[PDB]
Amino acid sequence: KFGWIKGVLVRCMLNIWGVMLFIRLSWIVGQAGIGLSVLVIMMATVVTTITGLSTSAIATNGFVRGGGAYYLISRSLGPEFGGAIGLIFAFANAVAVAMYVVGFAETVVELLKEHSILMIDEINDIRIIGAITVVILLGISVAGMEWEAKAQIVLLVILLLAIGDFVIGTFIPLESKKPKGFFGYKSEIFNENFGPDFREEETFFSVFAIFFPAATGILAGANISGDLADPQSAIPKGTLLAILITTLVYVGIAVSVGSCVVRDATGNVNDTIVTELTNCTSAACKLNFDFSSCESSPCSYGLMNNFQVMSMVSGFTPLISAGIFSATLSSALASLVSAPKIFQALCKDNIYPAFQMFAKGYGKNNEPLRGYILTFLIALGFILIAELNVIAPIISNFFLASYALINFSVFHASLAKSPGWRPAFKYYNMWISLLGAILCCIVMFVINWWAALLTYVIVLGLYIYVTYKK
Amino acid sequence: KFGWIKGVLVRCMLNIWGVMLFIRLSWIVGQAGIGLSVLVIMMATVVTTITGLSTSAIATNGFVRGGGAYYLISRSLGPEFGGAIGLIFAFANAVAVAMYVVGFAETVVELLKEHSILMIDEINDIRIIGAITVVILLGISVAGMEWEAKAQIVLLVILLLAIGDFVIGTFIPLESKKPKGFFGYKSEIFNENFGPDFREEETFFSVFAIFFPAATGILAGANISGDLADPQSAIPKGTLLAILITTLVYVGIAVSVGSCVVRDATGNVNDTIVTELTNCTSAACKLNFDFSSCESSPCSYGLMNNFQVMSMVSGFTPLISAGIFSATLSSALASLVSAPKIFQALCKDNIYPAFQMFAKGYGKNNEPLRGYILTFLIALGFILIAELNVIAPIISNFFLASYALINFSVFHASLAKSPGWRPAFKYYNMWISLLGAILCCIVMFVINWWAALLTYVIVLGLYIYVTYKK
Ligand SMILES: CCCCCCCC/C=C/CCCCCCCC(=O)O[C@@H](COC(=O)CCCCCCCCCCCCCCC)COP(=O)([O-])OCC[N+](C)(C)C
Ligand SMILES: CCCCCCCC/C=C/CCCCCCCC(=O)O[C@@H](COC(=O)CCCCCCCCCCCCCCC)COP(=O)([O-])OCC[N+](C)(C)C
Ligand SMILES: CCCCCCCC/C=C/CCCCCCCC(=O)O[C@@H](COC(=O)CCCCCCCCCCCCCCC)COP(=O)([O-])OCC[N+](C)(C)C
Ligand SMILES: CCCCCCCC/C=C\CCCCCCCC(=O)O[C@@H](COC(=O)CCCCCCCCCCCCCCC)COP(=O)([O-])OCC[N+](C)(C)C
Ligand SMILES: CCCCCCCC/C=C\CCCCCCCC(=O)O[C@@H](COC(=O)CCCCCCCCCCCCCCC)COP(=O)([O-])OCC[N+](C)(C)C
Ligand SMILES: CCCCCCCC/C=C\CCCCCCCC(=O)O[C@@H](COC(=O)CCCCCCCCCCCCCCC)COP(=O)([O-])OCC[N+](C)(C)C
Ligand SMILES: CCCCCCCC/C=C\CCCCCCCC(=O)O[C@@H](COC(=O)CCCCCCCCCCCCCCC)COP(=O)([O-])OCC[N+](C)(C)C
Ligand SMILES: CC(C)CCC[C@@H](C)[C@H]1CC[C@H]2[C@@H]3CC=C4C[C@@H](OC(=O)CCC(=O)O)CC[C@]4(C)[C@H]3CC[C@]12C
Ligand SMILES: CC(C)CCC[C@@H](C)[C@H]1CC[C@H]2[C@@H]3CC=C4C[C@@H](OC(=O)CCC(=O)O)CC[C@]4(C)[C@H]3CC[C@]12C
Ligand SMILES: CC(C)CCC[C@@H](C)[C@H]1CC[C@H]2[C@@H]3CC=C4C[C@@H](OC(=O)CCC(=O)O)CC[C@]4(C)[C@H]3CC[C@]12C
Ligand SMILES: CC(C)CCC[C@@H](C)[C@H]1CC[C@H]2[C@@H]3CC=C4C[C@@H](OC(=O)CCC(=O)O)CC[C@]4(C)[C@H]3CC[C@]12C
Ligand SMILES: CC(C)CCC[C@@H](C)[C@H]1CC[C@H]2[C@@H]3CC=C4C[C@@H](OC(=O)CCC(=O)O)CC[C@]4(C)[C@H]3CC[C@]12C
Ligand SMILES: CC(C)CCC[C@@H](C)[C@H]1CC[C@H]2[C@@H]3CC=C4C[C@@H](OC(=O)CCC(=O)O)CC[C@]4(C)[C@H]3CC[C@]12C
Ligand SMILES: [Cl-]
Ligand SMILES: [Cl-]
Ligand SMILES: [Cl-]
Ligand SMILES: [Cl-]
Ligand SMILES: [K+]
Ligand SMILES: [K+]
Ligand code: NA
Ligand code: NA
Numbered sequence: 001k002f003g004w005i006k007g008v009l010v011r012c013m014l015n016i017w018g019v020m021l022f023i024r025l026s027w028i029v030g031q032a033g034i035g036l037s038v039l040v041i042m043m044a045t046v047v048t049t050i051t052g053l054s055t056s057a058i059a060t061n062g063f064v065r066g067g068g069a070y071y072l073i074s075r076s077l078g079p080e081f082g083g084a085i086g087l088i089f090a091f092a093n094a095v096a097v098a099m100y101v102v103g104f105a106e107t108v109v110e111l112l113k114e115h116s117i118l119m120i121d122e123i124n125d126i127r128i129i130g131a132i133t134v135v136i137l138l139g140i141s142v143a144g145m146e147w148e149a150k151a152q153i154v155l156l157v158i159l160l161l162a163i164g165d166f167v168i169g170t171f172i173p174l175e176s177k178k179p180k181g182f183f184g185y186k187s188e189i190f191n192e193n194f195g196p197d198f199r200e201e202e203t204f205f206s207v208f209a210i211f212f213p214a215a216t217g218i219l220a221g222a223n224i225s226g227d228l229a230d231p232q233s234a235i236p237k238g239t240l241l242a243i244l245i246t247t248l249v250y251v252g253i254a255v256s257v258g259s260c261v262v263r264d265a266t267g268n269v270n271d272t273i274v275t276e277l278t279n280c281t282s283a284a285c286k287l288n289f290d291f292s293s294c295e296s297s298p299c300s301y302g303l304m305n306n307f308q309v310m311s312m313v314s315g316f317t318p319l320i321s322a323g324i325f326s327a328t329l330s331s332a333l334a335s336l337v338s339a340p341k342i343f344q345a346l347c348k349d350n351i352y353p354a355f356q357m358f359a360k361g362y363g364k365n366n367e368p369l370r371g372y373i374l375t376f377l378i379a380l381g382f383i384l385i386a387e388l389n390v391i392a393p394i395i396s397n398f399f400l401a402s403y404a405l406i407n408f409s410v411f412h413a414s415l416a417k418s419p420g421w422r423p424a425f426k427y428y429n430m431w432i433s434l435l436g437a438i439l440c441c442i443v444m445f446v447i448n449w450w451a452a453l454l455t456y457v458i459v460l461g462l463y464i465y466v467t468y469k470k
Numbered sequence: 471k472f473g474w475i476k477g478v479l480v481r482c483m484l485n486i487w488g489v490m491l492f493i494r495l496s497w498i499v500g501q502a503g504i505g506l507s508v509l510v511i512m513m514a515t516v517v518t519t520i521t522g523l524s525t526s527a528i529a530t531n532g533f534v535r536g537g538g539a540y541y542l543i544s545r546s547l548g549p550e551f552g553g554a555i556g557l558i559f560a561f562a563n564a565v566a567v568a569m570y571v572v573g574f575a576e577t578v579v580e581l582l583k584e585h586s587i588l589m590i591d592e593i594n595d596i597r598i599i600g601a602i603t604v605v606i607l608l609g610i611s612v613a614g615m616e617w618e619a620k621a622q623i624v625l626l627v628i629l630l631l632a633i634g635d636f637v638i639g640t641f642i643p644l645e646s647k648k649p650k651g652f653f654g655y656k657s658e659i660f661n662e663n664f665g666p667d668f669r670e671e672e673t674f675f676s677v678f679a680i681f682f683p684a685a686t687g688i689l690a691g692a693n694i695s696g697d698l699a700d701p702q703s704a705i706p707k708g709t710l711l712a713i714l715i716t717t718l719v720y721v722g723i724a725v726s727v728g729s730c731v732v733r734d735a736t737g738n739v740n741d742t743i744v745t746e747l748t749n750c751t752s753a754a755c756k757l758n759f760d761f762s763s764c765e766s767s768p769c770s771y772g773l774m775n776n777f778q779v780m781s782m783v784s785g786f787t788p789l790i791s792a793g794i795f796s797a798t799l800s801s802a803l804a805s806l807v808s809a810p811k812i813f814q815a816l817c818k819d820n821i822y823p824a825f826q827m828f829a830k831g832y833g834k835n836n837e838p839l840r841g842y843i844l845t846f847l848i849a850l851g852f853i854l855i856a857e858l859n860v861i862a863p864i865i866s867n868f869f870l871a872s873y874a875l876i877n878f879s880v881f882h883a884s885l886a887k888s889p890g891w892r893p894a895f896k897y898y899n900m901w902i903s904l905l906g907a908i909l910c911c912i913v914m915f916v917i918n919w920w921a922a923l924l925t926y927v928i929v930l931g932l933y934i935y936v937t938y939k940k
Binding site for chain 1: 882885886908911912915919920923927934938
């Protein structure tokens with residue numbers, strides 16, 4: 001089978017490290033400050049850590065036999081909690097597929113813009129590339145899965161190499177890169193970038209909703225709990241270590257990109273300030289550059305305007321593009337196999353008879369082709385809207401709802417003293433799980449109150465329907 | 471004992487008819503349109519009608535013995551729903567006391583301003599008068615309750631006389647009243663006032679939130695269900711007829727004041743337009759008055775600026791002041807006797823052991839003096855804030871919460887097929903109750919999302935605590 005490392009840690013890191021690490025973290029650091037983005041990352045880390053503690057408590061309760069995160073949750077805490085969590089998580093993964101594919105397509109379109117290869121329009125090209133990508137990924141999922149075990153390590157190595165390449169690039173200031181920002185590690189840039197600089201229609205929690213899908217993916221290790229040799233011990237430590245490593249990398253990258261790149265920058269070489277005019281207080285002014293004229297007009301570079309800041313900073317640019325592709329495609333593929341399997345397992349249990357027609361599977365491996373079609377349609381529908389910053393809040397809402405369900409389910413089972421609930425995890429507390437559920441609920445209401453209200457209305461309706469069923 | 475007219479209908483109408491009907495309905499008609507105010511009244515009427523159907527189902531379920539709405543709810547529908555509903559309703563009545571007393575104090579200060587009798591400040595005078603009024607009302611509730619049976623009829627007669635006096639006043643246009651608006655029943659004024667004219671920080675639901683406490687008070691007939699001769703027949707028809715009559719009066723008054731008084735008006739006599747300037751399209755311009763110059767400056771008269779439009783329109787001004795006092799004081803007294811009784815009944819059941827110290831009662835009639843002190847403190851604290859337009863949304867939030875609890879609890883009992891749930895009401899449907907609960911929840915999030923979220927988190931915490939208790 002799979003050892004704890006290759007079965008939980010690698011998959012969790014690959015699912016967590018997705019689209020926001022490379023093409024949105026720098027923008028988040030620009031919009032907030034360095035310290036305030038550290039606060040955002042810490043809040044997401046607290047949410048995912050409490051959810052991971054709850055998930056480990058679920059894993060340590062019961063028997064090894066049985067695979068899938070929905071299976072463990074349903075056999076541990078109630079048909080009603082199992083069904084609600086499974087449905088919400090399946091929808092969350094289905095829309096996460098779209099978010100990751102849109103990030104990949106945006107990166108591809110940005111790379112094509114360098115060669116001036118435009119087919120119809122930037123948004124239209126993003127839509128076309130996303131549709132092609134999701135079709136290809138669905139074909140890969142339904143046809144080729146034996147290569148996945150060998151490809152996980154390759155993708156993780158490529159992503160780590162891209163991260164190291166960016167970190168190396170931050171330590172090599174270049175004169176050519178200076179007009180586009182990236183003056184190197186300077187105290188002036190750190191001082192300027194420490195405070196928030198939110199623009200119009202940008203707040204702390206909008207940026208948090210953009211970032212939060214980065215922290216998601218912690219349930220990748222539990223999704224193949226059956227495939228693990230010792231799921232009761234592999235899942236807890238694997239998930240917790242993956243959360244720790246990804247959070248440390250996020251914090252380090254945020255601080256580095258905030259301390260090495262200015263918020264606003266032009267892209268023209270002959271912008272130097274030989275004689276200071278009125279003693280400009282900007283960090284770029286102290287670095288012999290004049291970006292004061294940029295803020296009046298639209299800027300095309302800097303933390304606030306360029307989503308490919310990390311690609312620019314890195315010494316070997318195509319490695320980062322491979323890293324972006326690796327991260328986005330790995331996360332999209334992980335979410336594209338998690339949702340159909342969860343939906344099929346939910347339909348086998350016949351929790352909702354309306355969805356029972358999706359229980360049919362085809363092939364030797366019992367592939368949920370009907371479920372695959374449903375998740376493909378959901379992902380495609382969310383790809384026809386081709387903005388990462390509008391899709392990401394939806395991902396945040398649904399993953400926060402799933403995490404609140406998991407935390408509240410374990411807390412309610414501990415409080416009710418359910419006969420089948422006796423977790424063996426040492427670091428699980430029912431009150432910390434309740435705190436995590438409350439935090440997720442409050443955060444998802446703060447991000448978007450009506451979307452959250454609709455989510456809870458649906459969740460309560462499903463819970464009541466399953467509770468009172470024939 | 472008490473019949474359905476003097477025991478349900480009269481008290482329900484007296485509790486429903488309060489501060490808004492007299493000092494905020496004209497302002498609501500000004501802010502919204504005539505049609506939009508009619509829509510507001512219809513939405514409130516739908517909410518209260520569904521809640522009344524649920525309450526009638528509760529009343530028809532069970533046995534006659536036992537008094538108080540909380541008693542019927544708890545005996546019919548669980549200890550958990552009963553306790554949550556009782557606590558939320560007690561808090562709602564405690565803050566409604568403050569709302570009604572603040573409205574009375576605002577009317578008193580407005581009357582005193584005519585004689586230029588100012589003690590400290592308008593807000594400070596409102597606060598002082600409200601504190602004195604709530605102290606006197608608490609003393610009345612503690613000591614004198616035998617007069618109340620003979621006082622309900624007198625208060626209702628006075629209020630109806632005030633309503634009729636206003637309606638008569640609308641039919642007697644006067645030259646002296648014309649500068650302050652009130653040009654009589656004219657088609658020009660109706661056409662102008664039909665469309666919304668919301669000001670800054672005023673929306674449909676903020677106006678709805680301000681109006682909604684007017685429609686509340688439908689459970690006053692149920693709070694003395696023990697005192698009724700035949701509660702299972704007295705409560706349903708009495709409550710429904712009271713809702714119908716009050717809604718018809720609200721609609722008629724709204725249409726009348728919108729069709730007889732202009733939105734903005736000055737207060738100076740020599741404002742006449744002998745020759746039209748640029749063919750002014752305002753209704754007042756067509757009525758030989760020039761209020762165009764008023765819109766640039768702050769206006770002191772009209773629907774938008776005067777809260778005592780109905781007092782001005784009526785032929786006998788002191789009668790309306792008696793009507794305002796009668797309505798406000800009757801509703802405040804009803805809430806101030808409902809809240810302590812419900813809290814004491816809740817504390818007797820020992821649903822929440824933290825509140826058990828409030829179960830003690832003094833006197834021959836077992837007056838909850840400890841409970842009276844708590845509601846007096848809550849009302850006083852909400853009187854220290856002396857704006858009706860800010861207290862009223864809180865009242866809307868908490869009464870909508872109580873109504874959603876009642877509707878959802880009866881729907882859940884019907885769905886769960888509880889052993890003690892077998893309502894005899896012919897016009898009760900569980901799906902209509904569920905729709906009413908959903909409507910109340912959605913409306914209370916629309917009015918104020920974080921207040922509604924806090925209320926529902928508290929309600930869920932209470933429900934879970936009672937469910938899993940020793
Ligand atoms: C903004 C985002 C942050 C969220 C803010 C709110 C965070 C609030 C978080 C709250 C978490 C609770 C922390 C209590 C810690 C006590 C430690 C202890 O030893 O107690 C002990 C007993 O004593 C108790 O039972 C604890 C009392 C819990 C009551 C909770 C109120 C909060 C509910 C919601 C408040 C709503 C707040 C809104 C208020 C308007 C432990 O209990 P036990 O039973 O012995 O455990 C054994 C179980 N076992 C046998 C299975 C092993
Ligand atoms: C704080 C207090 C105030 C709270 C109020 C706040 C408002 C919150 C409101 C919360 C809403 C909760 C209402 C419960 C839902 C109805 C459940 C039900 O009746 O099932 C019944 C009917 O079943 C059906 O008729 C069809 C099943 C529909 C699935 C359920 C709703 C899903 C909502 C999402 C839709 C997603 C699609 C839309 C989005 C794309 C089951 O059949 P039965 O025979 O009647 O049961 C008897 C069984 N017994 C005999 C064993 C007992
Ligand atoms: C997508 C969907 C996501 C859903 C998640 C998102 C929603 C999350 C919603 C979460 C709602 C919060 C639930 C909390 C549960 C209560 C804890 C409890 O049960 O009793 C605890 C005690 O607790 C106390 O002794 C304190 C008093 C009661 C606690 C507070 C309820 C009021 C909530 C705040 C009011 C503040 C008022 C402020 C006024 C200004 C446990 O004590 P025990 O002795 O161990 O119990 C033994 C019982 N047993 C033997 C059966 C085990
Ligand atoms: C929030 C989004 C919606 C939430 C989920 C929707 C949940 C809907 C889920 C399931 C729908 C229920 C289907 C009923 C069939 C189930 C079996 C059954 O009970 O038969 C029923 C047939 O009743 C009907 O067939 C009428 C259909 C009712 C649909 C509306 C419920 C309110 C929706 C609100 C939408 C608000 C929209 C927003 C408003 C602002 C028979 O029951 P009964 O005979 O009537 O009971 C008599 C009891 N008695 C004997 C004591 C008198
Ligand atoms: C999906 C179809 C639903 C149809 C049924 C419902 C009919 C439509 C119902 C209500 C319709 C109301 C439309 C908006 C009109 C303005 C309202 C307003 O006052 O602003 C408020 C919200 O409004 C917004 O934030 C605007 C953004 C659009 C969100 C719209 C409500 C979604 C309802 C989702 C329904 C989920 C369940 C769905 C059930 C099917 C916020 O104003 P505020 O100033 O921030 O408040 C602060 C208060 N304070 C100042 C005192 C602190
Ligand atoms: C305590 C336990 C019990 C649970 C009850 C807890 C109750 C909650 C307590 C508190 C809730 C906060 C109340 C603030 C009132 C502002 C009103 C307002 O402006 O409306 C807006 C406020 O929603 C926002 O988006 C604002 C978020 C940033 C502002 C931050 C201030 C502190 C919020 C820190 C709060 C977290 C505290 C710590 C938690 C981590 C909403 O309208 P909108 O955003 O324009 O609509 C967006 C729609 N769209 C996305 C489609 C565009
Ligand atoms: C924003 C949304 C607005 C609407 C929600 C507003 C809050 C609603 C507040 C109160 C409503 C009342 C609870 C809901 C209906 C429960 C009915 C039920 O199933 O009973 C069950 C018990 O229930 C429990 O054991 C604990 C309750 C957990 C319900 C959790 C759903 C989480 C969704 C959270 C989504 C909302 C998150 C809230 C914060 C935003 C089963 O009971 P039984 O089978 O009869 O067996 C009893 C055996 N006994 C007799 C021995 C004990
Ligand atoms: C998850 C762990 C780390 C506990 C964190 C709890 C609090 C310490 C966090 C949760 C919500 C955070 C708040 C969320 C929103 C804001 C608004 C934010 O204001 C801005 O948007 C920037 C305005 C400006 O300074 O220019 C200031 C930080 C603050 C108060 C945050 C302060 C820190 C808070 C209270
Ligand atoms: C893969 C990630 C997640 C973990 C590994 C982290 C390394 C990629 C980082 C951490 C410390 C960094 C080093 C910190 C200090 C330096 C010194 C710095 O200066 C030089 O040695 C000479 C530079 C030159 O002239 O080229 C060169 C980059 C380097 C090795 C950095 C290379 C990249 C390092 C090893
Ligand atoms: C992916 C993660 C796990 C590894 C990356 C973490 C570190 C390699 C980065 C992140 C934060 C960076 C620090 C951010 C700020 C500074 C201040 C900087 O100070 C100056 O040189 C300016 C002072 C001056 O010369 O005047 C020294 C480099 C340093 C420590 C950076 C060193 C490299 C750090 C530690
Ligand atoms: C039996 C009846 C009472 C059922 C009512 C259900 C709907 C017909 C009601 C419920 C919510 C109402 C809506 C609540 C909020 C608004 C926003 C409101 O916006 C404005 O204030 C526009 C101001 C302007 O015209 O300048 C317009 C009315 C409307 C759509 C209302 C239209 C009628 C709605 C949909
Ligand atoms: C909640 C209850 C109190 C509502 C009762 C309705 C009456 C108060 C309204 C409904 C019809 C109205 C009547 C409609 C028509 C007229 C004719 C009208 O004739 C005149 O203009 C006489 C002029 C004058 O007397 O100087 C006098 C008002 C009056 C009686 C109105 C008086 C007030 C009435 C009776
Ligand atoms: C407490 C309530 C139930 C008492 C009943 C209310 C009626 C006495 C009021 C409310 C609406 C009023 C109506 C609102 C608008 C008009 C239009 C108005 O039209 C004209 O005057 C046209 C003449 C012109 O301007 O040339 C005639 C009076 C009338 C029917 C009003 C008659 C008196 C009404 C019915
Ligand atoms: Cl991501
Ligand atoms: Cl996840
Ligand atoms: Cl009122
Ligand atoms: Cl009421
Ligand atoms: K992720
Ligand atoms: K009322
Ligand atoms: Na990834
Ligand atoms: Na009254």
